[PDB]
Amino acid sequence: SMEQVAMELRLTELTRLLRSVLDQLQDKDPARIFAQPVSLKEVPDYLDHIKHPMDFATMRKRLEAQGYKNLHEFEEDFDLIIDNCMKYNARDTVFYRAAVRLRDQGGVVLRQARREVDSIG
């Protein structure tokens, strides 16, 4: 049907928007602490602590398979990256502090993206 194509045009434009959002958020991690999943070869107990690991590479695989139906889903994944980091790593570490910074800087970009999604549909 034609309706199915027009829903596919809107998912495709969302995905165009979220790719921009993602690259904007990844720029706020110039250290690349969050670019890849945490290694289970280097942190073998990681899954005893963190139940739903998340990272920018994993978000990008999903994004490009148009697996984010809306901004909420994409925000959930972003918060996992931050939120898991602040649990695994103690407050006085470069990792925890890097998360705090990404969260705060990320909040501006996400604040305007929720406006563009609402505005444009």
Ligand code: NA
């Ligand atoms: Na902790």
